[PDB]
Amino acid sequence: SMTSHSWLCDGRLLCLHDPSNKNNWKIFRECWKQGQPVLVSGVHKKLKSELWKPEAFSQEFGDQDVDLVNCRNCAIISDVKVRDFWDGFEIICKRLRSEDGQPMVLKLKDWPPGEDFRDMMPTRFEDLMENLPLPEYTKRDGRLNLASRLPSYFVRPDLGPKMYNAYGLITAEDRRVGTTNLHLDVSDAVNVMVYVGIPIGEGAHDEEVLKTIDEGDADEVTKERIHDHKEKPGALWHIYAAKDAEKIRELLRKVGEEQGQENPPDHDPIHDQSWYLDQTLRKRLYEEYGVQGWAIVQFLGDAVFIPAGAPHQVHNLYSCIKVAEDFVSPEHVKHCFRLT
């Protein structure tokens, strides 16, 4: 039977089932006011799938100049063509190689650049913005989006959306690396998975994907969604409550000191965007500081809602295309205020 919603994370995470249901706000606003993230499934079925394929991005935009990042070591690959990223998205033998001769795990940095998404891709902009869930919160002019309504005493988000494109992490050593390292945003965000690639060349690495989800602390009902094999898994997220951010800073100051970093007692390891919390660090956070997070597997068509101030990290299981929009809900406007 079709149902309005379900629970993941043992009852701690709302999962809405119908992205365009006009009654979603009633269930949503009770969880959102408590500082929880929310998942909405099925957004891919609302979109024009031919607009979100890696081959179309390569054909239409392949000649633009860009920088990439090597996810394994943070090295920057400067001033290459965007087709050099897209043509290796799914075919491993076509990826740029490190000195060791291995194909690299790459992230495409700042593309489309700054606020240029709408001008560069007007048809993609329309398809995404017209199908975002919770539209009173997420649309630029929604009644519960204060972004366009606040004075300069508040940090306002840039005009979006922003596109996040990166290969999947592959090996046992890769399990300790982030696609996006631990950080926080002063605005709310909605992040939609519009394309996932489960490919070949080295296609048979489902076994390391299982171990990553399991060691990532994913719940049995998410474990049931994985092993059902109906839907495409994309990325593993860890999100933490905004109220826990300082305890996370204390853990990362102590670890930086144990690893012989030389850091002033006040420095901000979350703002630095330099850490990924692996299984060891997540267990230490829980045991030594009392802090529990949400381990979320984002499948094709899942929209993840991230509360303002909430620290969060992302680990791609396969090659992903994500598109995110920032907004300012009344529940969380304190997080962007410039005084006290």
Ligand X SMILES: O=C(Nc1ccccc1)Nc1cccnc1
Binds Cl ion (CB under 5 A): choice among 136, 250, 272, 278: 136
Contact partner, 233, from Cl ion, Mn ion, ligand X, none, Cβ < 5-8 Å per class: ligand X
Question: Measured from the CB atom, is 198 or 333 closer to ligand X?
Answer: 198
Residues 164-203 that bind ligand X (CB under 6 A): 198
Nearest-angstrom CA–CA distance, 334 and 306: 15
Count, residues near ligand X per rule CB under 6 A: 9
Residue 120: strand, helix, or coil: helix
Binds ligand X (CB under 6 A): choice among 209, 248, 323, 328: 209
Helix axes 220-228, 206-215, angle to 10 degrees: 170
Backbone torsions φ then ψ of 269, nearest 5 degrees: -65, -20
Nearest to 44 by CA among 54, 52, 36: 52
Taking CB under 6 A as the rule, does residue 206 contact ligand X? yes
Cis (ω within 30 of 0) for the bond into 161?
A: yes
Count, residues near Mn ion per rule CB under 5 A: 1
Pattern of binders to Cl ion over 104-123, x per CB under 5 A?
-----------------x-x
> Is 315 assigned a ligand-binding role in the annotation?
no
Question: Measured from the CB atom, is 40 or 226 closer to ligand X?
Answer: 226
Residues 175-194 that bind Cl ion (CB under 5 A): 180-181
Nearest-angstrom CA–CA distance, 203 and 325: 32
Question: Measured from the CB atom, is 84 or 185 closer to Mn ion?
Answer: 185
What the block records as the tokens of 174 is 């890769």
> Is 65 assigned a ligand-binding role in the annotation?
no
Nearest-angstrom CA–CA distance, 141 and 138: 8
Nearest-angstrom CA–CA distance, 95 and 107: 12
Nearest-angstrom CA–CA distance, 65 and 84: 10
Q: How far is the CB of 213 from ligand X (least distance, A)?
A: 8
**Chain residue at closest Cβ approach to ligand X:** 206
> Is 312 assigned a ligand-binding role in the annotation?
yes
Residue 122: strand, helix, or coil: helix
Q: How far is the CB of 226 from Cl ion (least distance, A)?
A: 25
The answer to whether the Cα torsion of 249, 252, 258, 264 is positive or negative is negative
Q: How far is the CB of 138 from Cl ion (least distance, A)?
A: 8
Nearest-angstrom CA–CA distance, 198 and 204: 9
Q: How far is the CB of 157 from ligand X (least distance, A)?
A: 34
Nearest-angstrom CA–CA distance, 192 and 175: 23
| Exposure string for 178-195, b = 16+ CB within 10 A, e = fewer | bbbbbbbbbbbbbbbbbb
Residues 178-197 that bind Mn ion (CB under 5 A): 185
Residues 225-264 that bind ligand X (CB under 6 A): 226, 229, 231-233
Q: Which residues bind Mn ion (CB under 5 A)?
A: 185
For binding to ligand X (CB under 6 A), which residues are involved? 198, 206, 209-210, 226, 229, 231-233
Q: Which residues are known binding-site members for Fe cation?
A: 183, 185, 312
Q: Which residues are annotated as a binding site?
A: 183, 185, 312
Q: Name the site residues for Cl ion (rule: CB under 5 A).
A: 25, 35, 121, 123-124, 134, 136, 180-181, 242
